[PDB]
């Protein structure tokens, strides 16, 4: 036995779904085996992308051109630093950026 | 599960996969001895109230449908167990006062 | 599983729990939010850097030794000796399951390696914005000037401070 | 940047996801509390008026006892998540108050406390059941590679910058502030003398201009 | 998260936020279900 989780995009986009059977092998149940369980209906892709629908154990799913794909999520673009003992990197130009940060403050004063 | 006709993008746990059994295995030790319940119920003489008899019965098979189909019993109230689901069970020891 | 925990494999018991409303649903949803939260908290405590920085093969850090904190390539998992020391000192059928984390130990170690490499090679500039390469002696000169100590102290006692740091 | 903020807030409706999640959690808790009234909790009917109209008190008391037992358990459970949710709401409100006090009313030198980059100021905005901060930050854009040295030999003495780091464009050496390229002639009014060249690792040879010498010569 | 953000990505001037003494810079390390920091601090030793 094991839990059943459905991986789907929004119903506005597509009605295609991907089914994950939690913490079981792909024996009793386009099949991808993960550490989180048995994934059926999602294609396996070598390429890594940003996580959209998290699954577990580094596996994330997304709806891309169309079918549901599964991949190991990327940690970001790799950027080596040209470090040496006699080189400095100093900015020559700057930009002023405005960012938006939202924090909840009040909860609805419900009296029962 | 979401009680809605529109599902947003994400993962949702909905049900639980279970393997259903198809074979029924019922096993009891194959004792062919007839149980002495007939001697207990059909004894010629019963003992007194304070000196109540106690018959320990072991190594037998009893069907208990004789207690059902006999209409001579004016008092039959079973308390701790359902008497109809008795032939499908097995017990350690049975005592008949 | 609330249903399997209370009334596993019993239709009458399931019918009785259906009479009590959605207590079963409430406790599963509560554990779903907790399980999401844990991965979320891991995300803000670890994934605060956009790029994965890697240290150069040259270890000329002014005498500062970082081989004990930097990952070892020989190991299949990219972890340090110290990280292995931490990981070595830390120690069913009733419907209870354990969900694996979204980020496992390998990408956690990769995130820590990226943070360490960015810190060592750039000071605070990789967190402020683009990673700017800085010599480590000059970086520690900035840090010493940040606490009211003149940089001449570092530039006269670099060997002593490196030896004390290694010790 | 403010125009881009306006465009982003007009386009992306999911930017207020935290506030929408708080509202949705409150609505779900209230809906659960409402729907729990329909449960029998072992009684023959979930309608109190139906129980009162159908049964005499000696059995109706047992039935309403089961009903109020289930209802009080549901109610105290609901109160439990209400207190917990109020706890993280209080924590978020304390965090927002600390953020606004240290970030709007002042200039916080904490990294990433007021968004990514070097913090200049922030402006709070009213929101339904929340507050929205617009963090104005200083972010570098364009950079270049330069050759640097920790100290400079003038006459065997070690010179260190009072503020900034020595840079070189390949032929000449300059001193500039740390977060912006602005090369200046390395003079005695920019650097201070401490120690000698035999101690500093990686010291180089240059010429330090003295403004007093042309004044004395003229 | 606050300790890593203001202690690894920068130089905090808060007392005892990154260990006893004058904080300079710190190292984060991976741990099971946690994070462990190596705070490098400046401590005076000999006085007159
Ligand atoms: C620094 O960058 C800014 C943009 O981020 C530059 O400003 C632009 O300069 C070009 C000239 O090449 C103009 O056509 C644009 O209209 C300017 N943009 C704005 C918003 O005014 C600026 O020139 C750069 N400065 C340096 C010294 O590189
Ligand atoms: C940094 O310190 C480590 C020890 O903690 C050094 O590793 C040792 O290197 C010597 C040879 O130099 C070996 O004989 C030891 O067996 C090594 N020990 C370990 C634990 O690896 C390392 O060489 C030092 N690096 C620098 C730059 O000095
Ligand atoms: C480094 O910067 C210096 C600035 O002082 C440059 O020197 C000037 O170069 C221009 C270009 O022909 C001349 O017109 C000036 O007379 C020079 N001034 C001095 C004081 O020498 C130098 O060319 C730059 N070098 C590089 C490689 O960029
Ligand atoms: C800066 O210039 C001085 C000379 O004024 C250099 O000193 C020389 O050092 C070498 C190596 O020890 C000696 O063989 C010479 O005799 C020294 N010169 C004199 C005049 O005594 C010094 O090395 C230079 N510094 C750098 C970093 O190049
Ligand atoms: C569905 O998606 C389209 C874009 O593909 C959008 O224009 C439309 O408003 C969306 N409708 C709903 C139901 O959200
Ligand atoms: C699944 O079962 C097969 C049976 O041969 C076994 O080899 C494999 O290791 C199992 N995998 C998992 C994920 O348990
Ligand atoms: C990834 O590429 C290898 C070849 O290098 C191939 O054998 C493998 O099947 C590919 N996997 C996927 C999921 O495309
Ligand atoms: C007692 O005698 C009757 C005779 O009809 C018989 O049916 C019954 O089985 C006997 N006793 C029991 C309880 O076995
Ligand atoms: C600095 O030099 C390195 C040499 O590898 C190069 O990769 C990098 O792009 C250069 N950066 C700038 C801003 O010139
Ligand atoms: C920097 O390291 C190189 C080794 O590649 C060495 O030759 C050079 O002298 C060093 N320079 C300084 C200033 O330490
Ligand atoms: C300073 O002098 C006092 C006595 O006046 C003495 O107790 C103390 O140990 C001295 N401290 C040092 C650092 O010499």
Tab-separated table of C-alpha atoms in Angstrom, chain C residues 1-165:
chain	number	residue	atom	x	y	z
C	1	UNK	CA	-3.163	7.950	7.075
C	2	UNK	CA	-6.054	8.787	9.384
C	3	UNK	CA	-8.379	6.330	7.615
C	4	UNK	CA	-5.864	3.468	7.725
C	5	UNK	CA	-4.774	4.305	11.279
C	6	UNK	CA	-8.234	4.354	12.832
C	7	UNK	CA	-10.149	1.976	10.561
C	8	UNK	CA	-7.682	0.103	8.363
C	9	UNK	CA	-9.461	-2.662	6.387
C	10	UNK	CA	-12.899	-2.345	8.017
C	11	UNK	CA	-15.934	-1.130	6.066
C	12	UNK	CA	-18.120	-0.667	9.163
C	13	UNK	CA	-15.363	1.313	10.887
C	14	UNK	CA	-15.037	3.481	7.767
C	15	UNK	CA	-18.810	4.025	7.833
C	16	UNK	CA	-18.571	5.112	11.472
C	17	UNK	CA	-15.729	7.561	10.792
C	18	UNK	CA	-17.827	8.999	7.951
C	19	UNK	CA	-20.450	9.868	10.594
C	20	UNK	CA	-18.009	12.165	12.439
C	21	UNK	CA	-17.455	14.567	9.557
C	22	UNK	CA	-13.966	15.508	8.339
C	23	UNK	CA	-11.754	15.073	11.459
C	24	UNK	CA	-9.765	12.602	9.299
C	25	UNK	CA	-9.428	15.207	6.499
C	26	UNK	CA	-8.413	17.985	8.969
C	27	UNK	CA	-5.469	15.975	10.454
C	28	UNK	CA	-4.174	14.868	6.995
C	29	UNK	CA	-4.357	18.490	5.709
C	30	UNK	CA	-2.552	19.663	8.890
C	31	UNK	CA	0.256	17.127	8.246
C	32	UNK	CA	0.293	18.170	4.573
C	33	UNK	CA	0.898	21.804	5.509
C	34	UNK	CA	3.615	20.789	7.979
C	35	UNK	CA	5.304	18.609	5.342
C	36	UNK	CA	5.232	21.474	2.835
C	37	UNK	CA	6.487	23.911	5.493
C	38	UNK	CA	9.554	21.790	6.287
C	39	UNK	CA	10.721	21.849	2.651
C	40	UNK	CA	9.866	25.565	2.545
C	41	UNK	CA	11.988	26.297	5.629
C	42	UNK	CA	14.828	24.330	4.047
C	43	UNK	CA	14.388	26.497	0.931
C	44	UNK	CA	14.794	29.830	2.734
C	45	UNK	CA	17.628	28.601	4.961
C	46	UNK	CA	19.654	27.147	2.099
C	47	UNK	CA	18.691	28.510	-1.345
C	48	UNK	CA	19.529	32.179	-0.820
C	49	UNK	CA	22.154	32.264	-3.603
C	50	UNK	CA	21.172	32.312	-7.275
C	51	UNK	CA	24.336	30.796	-8.781
C	52	UNK	CA	26.388	27.730	-7.878
C	53	UNK	CA	29.928	28.945	-7.233
C	54	UNK	CA	32.918	26.614	-7.410
C	55	UNK	CA	36.364	27.165	-5.940
C	56	UNK	CA	39.366	27.343	-8.288
C	57	UNK	CA	41.882	24.471	-8.108
C	58	UNK	CA	44.526	26.940	-6.875
C	59	UNK	CA	44.397	27.030	-3.067
C	60	UNK	CA	46.649	30.089	-2.614
C	61	UNK	CA	44.481	31.804	0.005
C	62	UNK	CA	47.332	33.607	1.752
C	63	UNK	CA	48.149	30.580	3.901
C	64	UNK	CA	44.552	29.985	5.003
C	65	UNK	CA	43.688	26.278	4.784
C	66	UNK	CA	40.135	25.417	3.708
C	67	UNK	CA	40.538	21.738	2.773
C	68	UNK	CA	38.641	20.737	5.930
C	69	UNK	CA	35.532	22.752	5.007
C	70	UNK	CA	35.643	22.518	1.164
C	71	UNK	CA	34.125	19.366	-0.506
C	72	UNK	CA	36.419	16.413	-1.431
C	73	UNK	CA	36.008	15.253	-5.122
C	74	UNK	CA	37.083	11.629	-4.355
C	75	UNK	CA	33.883	11.044	-2.292
C	76	UNK	CA	30.777	10.368	-4.494
C	77	UNK	CA	28.826	12.915	-2.371
C	78	UNK	CA	30.544	16.353	-2.546
C	79	UNK	CA	30.986	16.793	1.256
C	80	UNK	CA	33.810	17.866	3.598
C	81	UNK	CA	35.543	15.904	6.347
C	82	UNK	CA	33.844	18.137	8.922
C	83	UNK	CA	30.463	17.610	7.238
C	84	UNK	CA	31.069	13.853	7.356
C	85	UNK	CA	31.876	14.177	11.070
C	86	UNK	CA	28.534	15.921	11.647
C	87	UNK	CA	26.650	13.378	9.527
C	88	UNK	CA	28.242	10.466	11.406
C	89	UNK	CA	27.184	11.675	14.888
C	90	UNK	CA	23.399	11.708	14.295
C	91	UNK	CA	21.245	8.604	14.724
C	92	UNK	CA	5.161	1.265	10.082
C	93	UNK	CA	2.268	-0.747	8.632
C	94	UNK	CA	-0.402	1.293	10.458
C	95	UNK	CA	-0.748	3.965	7.767
C	96	UNK	CA	2.172	6.135	8.934
C	97	UNK	CA	4.647	7.097	6.197
C	98	UNK	CA	7.751	9.279	5.973
C	99	UNK	CA	7.956	11.584	3.001
C	100	UNK	CA	11.437	12.277	1.602
C	101	UNK	CA	12.603	15.903	1.561
C	102	UNK	CA	12.615	17.839	-1.695
C	103	UNK	CA	16.302	18.731	-1.261
C	104	UNK	CA	18.388	15.747	-0.228
C	105	UNK	CA	21.887	15.725	1.222
C	106	UNK	CA	23.674	15.961	-2.138
C	107	UNK	CA	22.094	19.242	-3.248
C	108	UNK	CA	22.255	20.501	0.345
C	109	UNK	CA	26.019	19.907	0.231
C	110	UNK	CA	26.141	21.568	-3.196
C	111	UNK	CA	24.345	24.639	-1.809
C	112	UNK	CA	26.754	24.823	1.133
C	113	UNK	CA	29.722	24.391	-1.229
C	114	UNK	CA	28.427	27.219	-3.424
C	115	UNK	CA	27.970	29.454	-0.370
C	116	UNK	CA	31.470	28.639	0.920
C	117	UNK	CA	33.113	29.228	-2.467
C	118	UNK	CA	31.248	32.498	-2.991
C	119	UNK	CA	32.100	33.713	0.511
C	120	UNK	CA	35.800	32.796	0.286
C	121	UNK	CA	36.290	34.186	-3.220
C	122	UNK	CA	34.111	37.314	-3.021
C	123	UNK	CA	33.448	38.504	0.541
C	124	UNK	CA	29.916	39.899	0.667
C	125	UNK	CA	29.697	40.885	-3.013
C	126	UNK	CA	28.146	37.589	-4.147
C	127	UNK	CA	25.310	38.131	-1.670
C	128	UNK	CA	24.986	41.821	-2.478
C	129	UNK	CA	24.913	41.148	-6.225
C	130	UNK	CA	27.302	39.807	-8.850
C	131	UNK	CA	30.275	37.875	-7.476
C	132	UNK	CA	33.407	40.051	-7.508
C	133	UNK	CA	36.742	38.273	-7.115
C	134	UNK	CA	38.754	39.531	-4.131
C	135	UNK	CA	42.075	38.234	-2.742
C	136	UNK	CA	41.472	36.636	0.642
C	137	UNK	CA	44.059	38.802	2.410
C	138	UNK	CA	42.263	41.902	1.118
C	139	UNK	CA	38.922	40.400	2.161
C	140	UNK	CA	40.178	39.822	5.707
C	141	UNK	CA	41.600	43.352	5.629
C	142	UNK	CA	38.068	44.587	4.923
C	143	UNK	CA	36.718	42.421	7.760
C	144	UNK	CA	39.359	43.727	10.186
C	145	UNK	CA	38.584	47.308	9.153
C	146	UNK	CA	34.914	46.501	9.769
C	147	UNK	CA	35.545	45.987	13.503
C	148	UNK	CA	37.799	49.008	14.042
C	149	UNK	CA	41.178	47.314	13.495
C	150	UNK	CA	43.661	48.875	11.078
C	151	UNK	CA	44.667	46.683	8.120
C	152	UNK	CA	48.368	46.960	9.025
C	153	UNK	CA	47.745	44.512	11.890
C	154	UNK	CA	46.618	41.857	9.397
C	155	UNK	CA	49.352	42.703	6.903
C	156	UNK	CA	51.962	42.316	9.647
C	157	UNK	CA	50.478	39.226	11.358
C	158	UNK	CA	49.018	37.305	8.385
C	159	UNK	CA	51.103	34.193	9.109
C	160	UNK	CA	50.158	34.218	12.802
C	161	UNK	CA	46.444	34.669	12.060
C	162	UNK	CA	46.546	31.911	9.428
C	163	UNK	CA	48.264	29.555	11.886
C	164	UNK	CA	45.721	30.368	14.608
C	165	UNK	CA	42.848	29.828	12.158
